[PDB]
């Protein structure tokens, strides 16, 4: 899991 | 049986993916993949309690998101408050035989989903594709260094965050010598992450892990 921002 | 239709195949000429933390493009469909095709990866949230994620769909061969072609963007929200890394946002790029790219982001924990549809450019776009390929080849070195720096910072950020969680959970069971050593190493790593020196970030990650072993025992012992 790479991360995502808003 | 003499007459027939010519068989063709559609291929993506440039990678397709989404922007992830650090402003980097993460690829879901590789360049030179034949259509139809369906690929998915799971992503998660970057902060505790984060209620939405932005899915920014990109095409191209550069590493900086800003330097690729923006195809579309939408949010998946209503993610109920949870620790970072708990939501499981599965993002699926599905290109059908008609060249339509269907993008879905679904939190598999809750079933909540949002979608967009991106149409294919009407031919011809040879110069655009060529220019993007050239732009990536000219900058392959710089892009590689950007990508490696971002990856390094994201790994340091991962160690920083889970170690801090483990300190907080360790509470008063963490001896003061250890507490001070770890806290100090957390600060040093946090400072390295603002730098552009990958070696220094890795060095501070290793120093942090070196002083965090008593912590890991307590963490393991509830």
| Token pair belonging to B25 | 């493009």
One CATH from 3.40.980.10, 3.40.50.720, 2.60.34.10, 3.40.1800.10 for B1-140: 2.60.34.10
Element (H, E) at A4: strand A2-4
The domain defined by B141-222 folds into Substrate Binding Domain Of Dnak; Chain:A; Domain 2 (1.20.1270)
Determination approach: X-ray
Q: What 3-state class would DSSP assign to A3?
A: strand
B121 reaches A (C-beta below 8 A): no
Burial class (CB in 10 A: 0-12, 13-18, 19+), B6: exposed
Q: Provide the sign of the torsion angle of the four alpha carbons B189, B191, B195, B200, taken in this order.
A: negative
Resolution attained, angstroms:
2.0
DSSP A2: E
CA distance A4 to chain B (A): 5
d(CA B57, CA B28): 10
Question: Between B18, B43, B51, which is nearest A1 by CB?
Answer: B43
Could you say which of B21, B75, B88 has the minimum Cβ distance to residue A2? B21
Rounded Cα–Cα distance for residues B41 and B84 (Å): 17
**SS3 letters across chain B:** CCCCCCCCCCECCCCEEEEECCCEEEEEECCCCECCEEEEEEEEECCCCCCCEEEEEEECCCCEHHHCEEEEEEEECCCCCCCCCCCCEEEEEEECCCCCEEEEEEECCCCCEEEEEECCCCCCCHHHHHHHHHHHHHCHHHHHHHHHHHHHHHHHHHHHHHHHHHHHHHHHHCCHHHHHHHHHHHHHHHHHHCCCCHHHHHHHHHHHHHCCHHHHHHHHCC
Query: Closest Cα partner for B91 from B111, B105, B74, B77?
Result: B105
- Count CB-CB contacts under 10 A for residue B98: 10
Tokens of B192: 């390295």
DSSP state of A5: -
Secondary structure letter of residue A1 according to DSSP:
-
Peptide bond into B160 cis (omega under 30): no
Question: Residue B126 has which token pair?
Answer: 């040879």
The answer to whether the CB atoms of B53 and A4 lie below 8 A apart is: yes
Residue with tokens 């003499």: B2
Q: For the stretch B45-73, what's the b/e string if a residue is b when 16 or more beta carbons lie within 10 angstroms of its beta carbon?
A: bbeeebbebebbbbbbbbbbbebbeebee
Where in chain B are the domains? Answer: 1-140, 141-222
């Amino acid at each position: 899991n790479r991360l995502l921002l808003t | 049986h003499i007459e027939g239709r010519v068989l063709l195949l559609d291929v993506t000429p440039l990678s397709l993916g989404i922007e992830t933390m650090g402003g980097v493009m993460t690829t879901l469909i590789a360049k030179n993949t034949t259509i139809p095709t369906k690929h998915s990866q799971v992503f998660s949230t970057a902060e505790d309690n984060q209620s939405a994620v932005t899915i920014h769909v990109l095409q191209g061969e550069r590493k900086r998101a800003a330097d690729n072609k923006s195809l579309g963007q939408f949010n998946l929200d209503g993610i109920n408050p949870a620790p970072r890394g708990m939501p499981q946002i599965e993002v699926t790029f599905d290109i059908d035989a008609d060249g339509i790219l269907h993008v879905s982001a679904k939190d598999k924990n809750s079933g909540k989903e949002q979608k967009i549809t991106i149409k294919a450019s009407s031919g011809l776009n040879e110069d655009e594709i060529q220019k993007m390929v050239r732009d990536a080849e000219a900058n392959a070195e710089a892009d590689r260094k950007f990508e490696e720096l971002v990856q390094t910072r994201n790994q340091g950020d991962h160690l920083l965050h889970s170690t801090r969680k483990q300190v907080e959970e360790a509470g008063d069971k963490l001896p003061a010598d250890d507490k001070t050593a770890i806290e100090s190493a957390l600060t040093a790593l946090e400072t390295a992450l603002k730098g552009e020196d990958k070696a220094a970030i890795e060095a501070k990650m290793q120093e942090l892990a070196q002083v965090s072993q008593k912590l890991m025992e307590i963490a393991q012992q509830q």
